[PDB]
Amino acid sequence: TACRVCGGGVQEFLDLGRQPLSDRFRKPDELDDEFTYRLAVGRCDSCEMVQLTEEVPRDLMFHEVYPYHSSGSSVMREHFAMLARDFLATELTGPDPFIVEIGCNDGIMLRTIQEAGVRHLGFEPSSGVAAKAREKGIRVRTDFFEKATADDVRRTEGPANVIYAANTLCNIPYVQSVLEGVDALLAPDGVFVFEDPYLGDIVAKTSFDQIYDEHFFLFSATSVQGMAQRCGFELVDVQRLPVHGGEVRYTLARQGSRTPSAAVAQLLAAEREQELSDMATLRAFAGNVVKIRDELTALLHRLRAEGRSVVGYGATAKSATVTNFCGIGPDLVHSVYDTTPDKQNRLTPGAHIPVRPASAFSDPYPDYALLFAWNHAEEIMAKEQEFHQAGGRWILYVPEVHIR
Ligand SMILES: Cc1cn([C@H]2C[C@H](O)[C@@H](COP(=O)(O)OP(=O)(O)O[C@@H]3C[C@](C)(N)C(=O)[C@@H](C)O3)O2)c(=O)[nH]c1=O
Ligand SMILES: Nc1ncnc2c1ncn2[C@@H]1O[C@H](CSCC[C@H](N)C(=O)O)[C@@H](O)[C@H]1O
Numbered sequence: 518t519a520c521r522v523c524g525g526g527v528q529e530f531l532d533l534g535r536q537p538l539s540d541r542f543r544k545p546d547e548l549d550d551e552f553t554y555r556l557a558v559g560r561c562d563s564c565e566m567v568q569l570t571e572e573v574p575r576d577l578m579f580h581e582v583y584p585y586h587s588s589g590s591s592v593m594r595e596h597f598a599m600l601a602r603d604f605l606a607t608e609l610t611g612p613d614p615f616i617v618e619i620g621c622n623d624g625i626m627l628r629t630i631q632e633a634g635v636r637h638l639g640f641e642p643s644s645g646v647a648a649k650a651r652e653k654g655i656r657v658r659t660d661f662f663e664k665a666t667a668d669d670v671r672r673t674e675g676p677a678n679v680i681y682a683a684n685t686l687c688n689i690p691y692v693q694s695v696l697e698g699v700d701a702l703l704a705p706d707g708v709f710v711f712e713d714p715y716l717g718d719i720v721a722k723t724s725f726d727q728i729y730d731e732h733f734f735l736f737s738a739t740s741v742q743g744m745a746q747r748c749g750f751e752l753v754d755v756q757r758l759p760v761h762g763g764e765v766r767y768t769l770a771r772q773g774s775r776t777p778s779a780a781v782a783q784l785l786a787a788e789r790e791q792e793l794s795d796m797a798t799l800r801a802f803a804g805n806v807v808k809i810r811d812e813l814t815a816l817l818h819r820l821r822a823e824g825r826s827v828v829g830y831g832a833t834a835k836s837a838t839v840t841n842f843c844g845i846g847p848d849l850v851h852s853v854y855d856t857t858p859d860k861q862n863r864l865t866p867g868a869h870i871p872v873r874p875a876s877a878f879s880d881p882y883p884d885y886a887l888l889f890a891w892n893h894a895e896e897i898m899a900k901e902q903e904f905h906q907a908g909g910r911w912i913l914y915v916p917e918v919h920i921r
């Protein structure tokens with residue numbers, strides 16, 4: 518496969534087998550026919566970009582009934598509001614500032630911008646969550662951001678001072694088109710800022726469930742620096758974030774317009790020192806992934822043989838990789854509890870575990886809950902103290918399989 522950033526050769530290091538769409542939740546009576554694709558991950562030989570080897574077409578993932586609602590997490594709501602206030606205090610202080618968000622979802626970030634009276638536009642090609650943002654008074658276009666739609670916004674609205682994307686840029690294999698988009702639309706002195714799951718964290722935590730249809734790229738500072746530079750931008754800041762299992766927020770500016778913070782060089786040097794993107798490191802990760810599969814299935818089967826009940830918690834997109842790679846279905850984990858109405862009373866993809874409202878996780882509790890939404894551990898466990906007090910325990914598989 519050719520690298521989507523530079524056209525280099527991509528070498529595979531992990532093959533997770535045949536997988537369903539991660540965000541497709543079927544009614545129980547639907548035909549058992551699903552779209553499947555081969556999920557495998559490689560690294561570009563030339564620019565070090567780690568990326569999937571098969572693309573899922575955008576319209577199969579993102580469309581009218583896409584079910585992920587960002588605002589379902591209190592930690593994320595606070596995280597995005599704070600980011601919005603930071604932009605309002607720094608990059609959006611001009612006379613007539615403009616901010617564009619790629620992937621605004623339900624408006625989790627842009628509601629703060631809208632509440633400050635700042636001109637803005639959200640790109641949200643999934644119309645059901647777009648309408649939730651529009652109900653908050655946010656300006657949203659139900660389109661994918663790409664060269665042409667960026668051109669159209671530049672023609673009608675002028676340059677954006679900030680273009681921001683969270684948990685969205687890594688989903689877009691046509692990143693070159695997005696970057697052309699950014700070049701057409703960003704002010705000469707603006708910034709393109711994006712935050713996504715960090716390769717460093719994935720490798721350290723063996724958090725392979727971060728790999729699924731919607732995560733095409735696993736960005737690093739080294740690869741993002743290369744990608745920027747090849748397109749006339751420059752990586753000028755990096756910030757590590759705890760959300761979503763570990764992320765980096767990357768700040769890109771037009772080349773030479775701003776001087777990189779010391780943080781960029783320091784993270785580049787740590788990745789080079791730790792051999793983050795070396796093929797050998799990435800294969801060692803792939804072998805750790807198999808070890809986690811084998812320990813998790815051994816545990817789940819032992820639990821069953823010992824007459825212990827087991828459910829899951831959080832109908833994450835990520836969990837589709839776990840259940841389908843590991844072969845875990847309703848035999849072993851009888852239900853998954855989730856707060857999203859459009860995932861409730863439906864079956865998880867590929868493995869077909871029933872999803873039930875989180876309100877149903879109550880006395881009498883199961884013996885064990887497999888914590889799919891482990892990136893939300895603290896928020897979830899805080900709301901489920903009674904479960905743990907009653908003696909129920911969590912099963913985690915990041916960074917290793919363990920119960921607590
Ligand atoms: C906080 C909380 C969540 N839950 C439930 C709600 C969600 O269905 C799921 C968590 O999904 P969560 O880890 O955020 O994203 P997912 O892996 O799906 O990934 C999705 C798809 C996507 C865009 N590709 C991505 O990268 C991230 C940003 O979002 O867990 C509770 O039940 N109780 C709670 O208290
Ligand atoms: N080319 C593109 N432009 C804009 N949004 C896109 C896109 N491709 C996918 N999306 C949107 O990207 C969103 C990813 S979900 C992440 C939402 C939010 N920023 C958060 O961090 O929680 C989805 O709502 C999807 O519809």
Ligand SMILES: [Zn+2]
Pocket residue numbers: 520521522523524525561562563564565566
């Ligand atoms: Zn490349």
